[PDB]
Design an enzyme around this catalytic site. Structure first.
Site, PDB file in Angstrom:
ATOM      1  N   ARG A   1       0.446  -1.072  -0.144  1.00  0.00           N
ATOM      2  CA  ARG A   1       0.046  -0.110  -0.110  1.00  0.00           C
ATOM      3  C   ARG A   1       1.145   1.171   0.281  1.00  0.00           C
ATOM      4  O   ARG A   1       2.220   1.015   1.166  1.00  0.00           O
ATOM      5  CB  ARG A   1      -0.915   0.050   1.021  1.00  0.00           C
ATOM      6  CG  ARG A   1      -2.397   0.652   1.414  1.00  0.00           C
ATOM      7  CD  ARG A   1      -3.353  -0.178   1.513  1.00  0.00           C
ATOM      8  NE  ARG A   1      -4.148  -1.343   0.194  1.00  0.00           N
ATOM      9  CZ  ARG A   1      -5.160  -2.356   0.853  1.00  0.00           C
ATOM     10  NH1 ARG A   1      -5.569  -2.132   1.774  1.00  0.00           N
ATOM     11  NH2 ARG A   1      -5.380  -2.767  -0.094  1.00  0.00           N
TER      12      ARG A   1
ATOM     13  N   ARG B   1       2.818  12.165   5.738  1.00  0.00           N
ATOM     14  CA  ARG B   1       2.996  14.231   5.715  1.00  0.00           C
ATOM     15  C   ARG B   1       3.055  14.925   7.543  1.00  0.00           C
ATOM     16  O   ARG B   1       3.035  15.649   6.814  1.00  0.00           O
ATOM     17  CB  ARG B   1       1.793  14.347   5.218  1.00  0.00           C
ATOM     18  CG  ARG B   1       1.682  15.860   5.147  1.00  0.00           C
ATOM     19  CD  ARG B   1      -0.171  16.432   4.979  1.00  0.00           C
ATOM     20  NE  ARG B   1      -0.657  17.351   4.781  1.00  0.00           N
ATOM     21  CZ  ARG B   1       0.041  18.341   5.579  1.00  0.00           C
ATOM     22  NH1 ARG B   1       0.719  17.784   6.600  1.00  0.00           N
ATOM     23  NH2 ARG B   1       0.065  19.667   5.799  1.00  0.00           N
TER      24      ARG B   1
ATOM     25  N   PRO C   1      -6.778   7.597   7.155  1.00  0.00           N
ATOM     26  CA  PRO C   1      -6.047   6.442   7.444  1.00  0.00           C
ATOM     27  C   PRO C   1      -5.946   5.320   6.164  1.00  0.00           C
ATOM     28  O   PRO C   1      -4.977   4.754   6.105  1.00  0.00           O
ATOM     29  CB  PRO C   1      -7.073   5.329   7.794  1.00  0.00           C
ATOM     30  CG  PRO C   1      -8.464   6.404   8.566  1.00  0.00           C
ATOM     31  CD  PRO C   1      -7.894   7.593   7.521  1.00  0.00           C
TER      32      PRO C   1
ATOM     33  N   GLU D   1       1.792  36.961   9.712  1.00  0.00           N
ATOM     34  CA  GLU D   1       1.442  36.280   9.038  1.00  0.00           C
ATOM     35  C   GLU D   1       0.525  37.129   7.996  1.00  0.00           C
ATOM     36  O   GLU D   1       0.008  36.421   7.438  1.00  0.00           O
ATOM     37  CB  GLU D   1       1.146  34.871   8.606  1.00  0.00           C
ATOM     38  CG  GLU D   1       2.758  33.919   8.904  1.00  0.00           C
ATOM     39  CD  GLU D   1       1.718  32.453   9.416  1.00  0.00           C
ATOM     40  OE1 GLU D   1       2.076  32.160  10.705  1.00  0.00           O
ATOM     41  OE2 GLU D   1       1.476  31.329   8.574  1.00  0.00           O
TER      42      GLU D   1
HETATM   43 GD   GD3 Z   1       3.931  27.949  11.911  1.00  0.00          GD
END
Ligand code: GD3
Ligand code: GD3
EC number: 3.6.1.13
Lengths: 202, 204
Positions: free
Chosen positions: B51, B56, B134, B157
Site C-alpha cells: 500500500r 505527511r 487512514p 503572517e
Molecule cells: Gd507556523
C-alpha cells in the site's frame, strides 16, 4: 467572508513526482497576498488519490448505526491498532454519482440495501497535502439484515460489520474510539440532527 | 501477568506484521510503500499486501473560542489542493501547525495562535484527535479549544493569513451550508455546537 478566487491564482505548472496506483503531484503557482500583491513562485507537494463517497448507515426505527471494521496500516504508527471502525465508502470512479457509489458500497461492504438516502456534508480531509474530497450522505437501512464475515475473504477490503446504538457510536467518537475523519463528522452530524431525521423518515 | 488492553475492534497490532517499507519518493513529504500481512476475520493469514502511504507528519489544531461573547476566530488562507474541487482555494480554517520533536500539541497550538491570529490563548482543553484518511495517509491532527477574547483579534503572517471573527452560530451555519468544508474546522465546529453551553459554564 472569503475574498479571493481562482482569478487570484496563477498555476504556473504541475508535475507528477511519482505515479503508482496513486500519484503525488507538484503544484507551482503564485497568488494574491492579503495586502494586494502577488507572491513569488510557491511550491506544494500534493497527494492525488481521487475523491471519496461515504455513507452513514442509519436505522431510524431501532435508532442504531451500522459500522464497518477493517485494517488501515497508515494508522499503525499513531494508534493502538490499524483496525478501524468506519463508515461505508468507496472511491468515486469515472462518471459515477456519489449517491450510487455509496449505495453500491453499502451492499458490497455491509451487505445492506439502502432505501432512501440524503446528503450530509462534503469535506476535504486535509487541504494542506491532498486534493481528496469526501461526500458523506446518510442512508436509511435495516440494521437487522447486515452480513457477516466472508469465508473466502477479500484481502484488499476484508470487512467485519458491527451494529451498535446511535448514542453509543457517538460516545465512542467523543471517547476517541472512533477517530477517522469520515466517521467523526458523519456521526457528529447525526448527533446534531438525529431527532429531526427520525421524524422525517419513518 | 498484565491483562491485554481493550479494543473496540477485533484485531490488534499483534495480528499484523510489517515486512518492510520501500520508498517510492521523498521530498519534505514522502510517499512510502508498506508491505505487510495480517489476520483476516475468517481466522486466516493474508498474503502479502502492498500500500502506498503519504507520510505527511502530524498536526496541532486549535479552536479559538470566546465563551462570554460566544464568538469564534477563524483564519482565511489558500490551500491549492482544493483548487480542483472547490470554488476557491481560499479556505476558512482553525489555527494549526506541524508538531515536531520535543513539542507538545498544546505548545504548537499556543504558538500558532499568536503568529497566525495574534490571539493569546488562556485556558486550553483537549477536544479530540483524528486521522485524516487512514486509507492513504498517516496524518493525524489533535484538537483543542482555546479560551480566547475575540476583541484581542489581530499579526505576523497577516499578508499570508487573514483573520476573521464571527459568532459561533454563524460559523456553524457556514459548516451546514458548506462555506467551511475542511476536516479540522468541520469536526471542531460541530464538536463545539454540541458542547458550547457546557464549555461556557466551565470557563464561566
Ligand atoms: Gd507556523
Ligand atoms: Gd469497495
Amino acid at each position: 467572508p472569503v475574498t479571493f478566487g481562482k482569478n487570484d491564482v496563477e498555476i504556473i505548472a504541475r508535475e507528477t513526482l511519482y505515479r503508482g496506483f496513486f500519484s503525488l503531484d507538484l503544484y507551482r503557482f503564485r497568488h494574491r497576498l492579503f495586502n494586494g500583491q502577488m507572491s513569488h513562485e510557491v511550491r506544494r507537494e500534493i497527494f492525488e488519490r481521487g475523491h471519496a463517497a461515504v455513507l452513514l448507515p442509519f436505522d431510524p426505527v431501532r435508532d442504531e448505526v451500522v459500522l464497518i471494521e477493517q485494517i488501515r496500516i497508515a494508522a499503525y504508527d499513531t494508534s493502538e491498532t490499524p483496525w478501524l471502525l468506519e463508515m461505508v465508502a468507496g472511491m468515486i470512479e469515472e462518471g459515477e454519482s456519489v449517491e450510487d457509489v455509496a449505495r453500491r458500497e453499502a451492499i458490497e461492504e455491509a451487505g445492506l440495501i439502502v432505501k432512501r438516502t440524503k446528503p450530509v456534508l462534503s469535506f476535504l480531509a486535509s487541504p494542506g497535502g491532498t486534493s481528496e474530497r469526501s461526500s458523506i450522505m446518510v442512508g436509511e437501512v435495516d440494521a437487522t439484515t447486515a452480513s457477516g464475515i466472508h469465508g473466502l475473504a477479500d484481502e484488499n477490503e476484508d470487512i467485519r460489520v458491527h451494529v451498535v446504538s446511535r448514542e453509543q457510536a457517538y460516545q465512542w467518537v467523543e471517547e476517541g474510539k472512533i477517530d477517522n475523519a469520515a466517521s467523526v463528522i458523519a456521526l457528529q452530524w447525526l448527533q446534531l440532527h438525529h431527532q429531526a431525521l427520525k421524524n422525517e423518515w419513518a
